[PDB]
Amino acid sequence: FASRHGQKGVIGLIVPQEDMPWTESGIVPDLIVNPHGIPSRMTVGQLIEAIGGKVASLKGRRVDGTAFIGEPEEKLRKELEELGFKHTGREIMYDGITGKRLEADIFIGVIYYQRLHHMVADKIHARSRGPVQVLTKQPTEGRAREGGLRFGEMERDVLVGHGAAMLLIERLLEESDKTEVWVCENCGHIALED
Amino acid sequence: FSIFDHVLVPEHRVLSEEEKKALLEKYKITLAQLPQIKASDPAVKALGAKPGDVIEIKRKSPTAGVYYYYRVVVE
Amino acid sequence: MIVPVRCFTCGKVIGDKYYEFKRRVEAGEDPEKVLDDLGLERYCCRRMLLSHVELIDDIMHYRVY
Amino acid sequence: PPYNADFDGDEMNLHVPQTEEAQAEARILMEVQNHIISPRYGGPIIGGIQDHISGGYLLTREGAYFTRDEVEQMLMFAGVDITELPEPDKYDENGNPLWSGKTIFSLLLPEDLTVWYRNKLCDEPERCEALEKLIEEKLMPDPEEVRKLAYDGFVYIQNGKLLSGAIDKKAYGREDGIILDLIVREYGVERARQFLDQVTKLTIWVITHKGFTTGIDDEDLPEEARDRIREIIREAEERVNKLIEAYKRGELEPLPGKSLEDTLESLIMAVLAEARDNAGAVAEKYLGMDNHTVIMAKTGARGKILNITQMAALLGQQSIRGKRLYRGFRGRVLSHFKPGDLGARAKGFVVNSYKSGLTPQEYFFHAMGGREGLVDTAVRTAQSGYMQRRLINALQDLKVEYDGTVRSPEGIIVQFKYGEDGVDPMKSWRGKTVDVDRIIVRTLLKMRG
Amino acid sequence: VSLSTIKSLIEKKGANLPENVKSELYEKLKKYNEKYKLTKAEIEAIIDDVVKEYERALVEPGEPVGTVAAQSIGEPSTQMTLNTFHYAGVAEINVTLGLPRIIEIVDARKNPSTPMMTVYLDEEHRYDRAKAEEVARRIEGTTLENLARSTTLDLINFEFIVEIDPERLERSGLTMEKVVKKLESSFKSAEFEVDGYTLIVRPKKADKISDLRRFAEKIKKHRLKGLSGVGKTIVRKEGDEYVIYTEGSNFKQVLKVPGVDPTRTRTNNIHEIAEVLGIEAARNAIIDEIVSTMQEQGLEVDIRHIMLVADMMTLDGIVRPIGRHGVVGEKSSVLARAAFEITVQHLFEAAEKGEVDNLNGVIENVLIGQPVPVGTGMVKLTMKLPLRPQ
Amino acid sequence: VQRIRQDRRSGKISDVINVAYYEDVKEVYVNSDDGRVRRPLIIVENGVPKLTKEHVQAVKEGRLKWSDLIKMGIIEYLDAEEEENAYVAMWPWEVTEEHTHLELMPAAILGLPASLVPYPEHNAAPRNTYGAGMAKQSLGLGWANFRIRVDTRGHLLHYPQIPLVNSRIMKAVGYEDRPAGQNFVVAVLAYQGY
Amino acid sequence: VTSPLDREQPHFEARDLHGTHWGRICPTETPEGPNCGLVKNLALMAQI
Amino acid sequence: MFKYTRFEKARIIGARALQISMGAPVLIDVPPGITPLEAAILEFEKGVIPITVIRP
Amino acid sequence: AQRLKGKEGRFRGNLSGKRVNFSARTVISPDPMISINEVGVPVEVAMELTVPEKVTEFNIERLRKMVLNGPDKYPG
Amino acid sequence: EDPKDPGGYFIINGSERVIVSIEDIAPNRTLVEKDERQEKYIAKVFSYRHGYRALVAVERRKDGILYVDIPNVPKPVKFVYVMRALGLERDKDIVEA
Ligand SMILES: [Mg+2]
Ligand SMILES: [Zn+2]
């Protein structure tokens, strides 16, 4: 999921309704975001939109948010104050499990979120044996044709750095392109079996 | 002025034959396995060295106070 | 496509109130008073009626049998 | 932190070894708990991040107290196998027991642990000096005196009891987790794993059930701060204009910088940077530690003071490649300014903040600023990759032999003793061969106790 | 106990400890013994614990230190800013920083992008600012056109018209007749008409139309009073000692300039240090330069990896690059070199020379699918057959 | 150049001709070729914008069109060459004597997807770039022909919603008839560390 | 709008935001990877 | 023994696990349902090891 | 000549690295309730990826039961 | 068809192909650039006629002599040489031009 202000993320956990907190005015959040994502991302526009969404929903009219001529923030805060809510946009909620109110009042509003098309049902991929190519006889490439994942050179250097020689052999040679060849002991040319 | 007084230049010393054999036997090496130092190197010229000898270098490492490094002289 | 049956957050049935709200607000009534009259009080419900767009009418033309 | 991964759409690969030798190598060499200490600098890498540090601060801050039910619930949630609660610390009204956060945290520590240091939250050096004098006088001062002279800013642990301090990034953080490093060096990887698995859950419970949020009013400065910031900006602009006029009259003194214009630009940039720093100083001064964003920034959980001063006071000066914005029309970046203008605003200085909104010209200047960072990362990745490939191919197959020497494949002796010392950097004490002071203090406290 | 007893106990038990460990242990033991009373048993236990820790901290045989060092140098490389400040500011000279500086150091370019030297002053002229600019002027290099405030290559009369400012002579301590005699000594058959703030040059070949501007510019280009290849000279006091910094670099010649302290004089040109001081000094120069860059950018990298890199780079008495023309080019294995770069040419060259690959590296064993000779690949095991289940 | 400007504004010649002069080198440039990128601007004469209130009223009533304003000498297109001689005033109240043009709408300097972000001047530039790029990946009723179209891949969002806080541009460009997201009730707090 | 230059090279000067783009090229909409600064979109008030 | 490096311990455990899988008897009683590898780790931890390591 | 050389050539990208069997890839989601040395694996991946186990005396019962479970129940 | 569909794209073999606009240098215009490696001051023009492009450059080297680069000409020719080759042989004519 992603918002219009650049905040992106994946669903981390799905929570039953009775375990969700609820504000003192009877609102149960649809979605919870982490407070650590706001600073170092510096997207005050998201907070302004959060205030504006609840102001618009309470007032029954949509809110202009044009680039430079939109409704100023102070007007939105004053209007929110006039409707019976705190100007800061914060509210008092009670914890879902314990059932007693949290020590701090919490920020809550309405924000526009979009579902992206990078969905896990189209990204999961597994390969146990599968088919192989022709020239190299290595596993194919691509999810559609039951391909295998790529174990590049960097992974080889990582495995060397750990010092796991037999693990390197197992990941590289044992499970792909095993071969047996006869060779004469004076030329070294590949001996031709009959 | 000599280059041995610079802070970046560690001490150098020409090893004699007995400790040459002792060092060559300690690490199970021959003369070809040691690091090489050119004949025209200013340190070699200052020491008056000769290709064939090995120079003992006393390093000043931050991790260890004294560390000995050996180099063989080539042209 | 069409108006949802229940509010996504709390679950109050608001499916039948969209057309009345649209007609009343189009007539000239203040939308806030109309929403208050319909019974919707928490803003989670009001959002669903306010931000809804009717798209079933302009996709009904293309039929597939 | 090891994988450098974030849960914003990242994907990871999983490999299943098939042979018994491969399984044994994976189990013995590459277990996660074996790589807590980084081999790059000899410090911890697998440590707490974000909510762990913030919840630690919330739990062990001064004035934090917890009831019976909260204590039992959080102890069970963490997984600690306690059986009887300790004696209550303070009795509140209505005769209900209360436990300080320090006791709950100390329940998670080993029995024999003693360490003291200064964390990032220190702001009054006098208190730390007094505490250090008390500790240094005799190495085991009476606990009651230390509780009397407690101060968030001097973490002090005595035989597993947290006597004074607040959990910070220096406790079990990603970079300088002193407590985690000490545990993993003195007890073992299993003990460090258990300690981490307990503290993470406990801090998560604290931050979840105490409440932690940030909002639009986290940057609401009072009127006095805004007036001061406006005064600073106006003074800086006046100084820049005076410098420009002096340059125009030709009275400007050429700096050791070769070109007079370059001297002018350097002076202007120095003035603007100082102005932004002063504005940041006053903005930080007027925001206390009750603000959640300030808590997150100070403890090192997330962000830094620059983000606060840019969201609260002003963005500052935008530049590309270390120079003010100059590309555009002849003698002007945008057509909305007169040609030949060198003023602060006309070349990129943004006097607004993210909270107060940016005028369109400031918006364009900021976009021009950010494009440079984007392309910088895009090119830096490839350059670093090529360099790493060359280095890896150069130094791939050097190894430590059984006699301590490092030898090339043909047999040349690269080093007669690895690292000049023979000590693995991973096992070193933050780059030191051995921490003598810590060993002396530990032994002295152990036997004399 | 007595300090001599402490020394005897340190020497008797800590036999295998490094020198720095012994010295630091002695100092800390003295301090903690004077601060707090210590018994003999306590000191013995402390030394035993130190010995145990040192033994436990030793490297494990078979560790692949080279790959670890390469990754430790390369992983932070994705973090420094390829675009540095590019602004010297005041009392500084701009120098390439971040990734480009590290790349230049590693590739061992014959000449760096911003050659900057460091000239520590001798006992005299160090505490005296005036003597500091005396030394600077002894090494500061300025050209004829640098002195002048304005210059007009007059083609109407086919002579030189130049307006010299007093500022350059004020800073450099020079005089008009000094420049005059320098021009007389440097060039002949030129007028060199001496004036207050003007010089007129009108050689015979400049009388015609086709041979004036080039010769006039060439004469105007000449540098005087300066050591070759040295630009501006910033002087700043660090601690209680003034130091000099120069644009450009000539390390061979500066060391003979009076007033310079040759002991602490350093430069950022590693090849220059190698030619003047030797390969062993170039090793320390490389280590110090990389450490300075890493510390400046705020990334912490252990010294041992840089030690390994520097030791490998100076294995043959020459500071070779790590690229295809350097350390990699010296690998005996043909397949290892072929895998890196320029495969076909290396293969054909090996075929011509009839070289032999002994397969003693990681890459070849990986290609053939045999155990690599690092880590678990070097362990050899035996066992007694008549196993008793018990 | 004054003569050519007067002829262009009167309507004697086409509006694709652009003239710019360079005083330093004494050169006059006339451009009538293909592929120049231009923007419209309101012509300011003697410190008075040529677009008056009754013109706006006529445009609103439908009696007047954009092409009529172009042909009336009220609005002229400027390319990168002619803009070298201009001194544009950003806002209507900032028009002074030396100004020669007035900006029409500063919020239109942004591209089509970048206009989706409400209050875009309150965000850091990289976050705005990420949001603009991600606005092209969200699901929604993109086109009404999805039932009978034949594309390799396609997504449909069951209950799209108009954003509560929206810029006035996307109502004009038609985005609000094909929305691509929903309005969530968002709370900002840490929950179980998930 | 796309540029014909090769993406592999840095092209530090080409990828930057010129001052003449005001009103002709969107300052924000641009790809993330190697195409950053070489692929651009017309502003709303543009007229070829 | 004197001291077992990480690589030597890994090698010994791998060899013992392979031998146990191929049919060698286990010299220590083990819980039911354990994999051969974890049986090897239990055997090593008990201290009964039949494989010695050769040093240069 | 071009077959051997290059990133996609024979020498590098074909022997140095290659596609591998017994591997999977999917997105990552946080979970603080497991130990730091554990990974949550989808049940679907477990049914596909396999580990060959030799039947010995101490694991005959478990392996027999899991064979009885077949390839459609999880512990199979 | 969707009435909101804007058009402006082609259909080729049942797939919708769109032509992205290329950003090229302005044709038949002189642009002067700096070449400090060879200390040559170069002006370039991309002349267009019937789809054919012609990179014609006149440059001044350190010697102060003007040379002209022409397509299919292996090496630069002296400026007044090619100027004479276009008629206009009298030196006063070049001086005036
Ligand atoms: Mg990510
Ligand atoms: Zn509701």
Side-chain angles (χ1 to χ4, degrees), chain A residues 26-27, chain C residues 6-12 14 40 42-48:
Chain A
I27 278 79
Chain C
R6 310 166 90 122
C7 167
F8 290 150
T9 284
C10 69
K12 168 179 262 311
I14 67 179
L40 309 190
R42 293 167 320 248
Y43 52 94
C44 71
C45 311
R46 318 179 85 154
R47 152 207 58 160
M48 301 224 50

Side-chain angles (χ1 to χ4, degrees), chain E residues 303-324:
Chain E
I303 183 69
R304 268 100 163 180
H305 316 293
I306 307 167
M307 294 208 183
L308 191 44
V309 177
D311 274 333
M312 182 76 148
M313 255 169 62
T314 63
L315 198 52
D316 289 5
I318 309 298
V319 191
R320 337 174 61 99
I322 85 166
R324 98 184 58 97

Side-chain angles (χ1 to χ4, degrees), chain A residues 14-84:
Chain A
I14 296 119
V15 171
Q17 191 192 293
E18 49 258 25
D19 293 346
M20 292 289 267
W22 80 93
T23 70
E24 190 150 335
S25 64
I27 278 79
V28 184
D30 272 300
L31 173 131
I32 299 168
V33 295
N34 205 282
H36 292 294
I38 310 309
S40 97
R41 259 63 171 276
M42 280 160 45
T43 56
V44 202
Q46 192 171 250
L47 312 182
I48 298 180
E49 175 182 20
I51 291 295
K54 110 196 294 178
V55 167
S57 165
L58 275 166
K59 212 165 52 151
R61 314 168 161 290
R62 271 194 216 82
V63 162
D64 185 348
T66 318
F68 307 105
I69 63 192
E71 306 201 18
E73 157 208 358
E74 308 85 351
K75 158 181 310 182
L76 297 169
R77 318 251 313 249
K78 169 57 71 163
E79 276 183 9
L80 190 47
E81 208 208 16
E82 290 299 333
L83 297 163

Side-chain angles (χ1 to χ4, degrees), chain D residues 165-176:
Chain D
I167 288 304
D168 192 13
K169 189 153 106 72
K170 274 211 180 38
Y172 48 84
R174 159 194 205 287
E175 177 66 287
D176 42 66

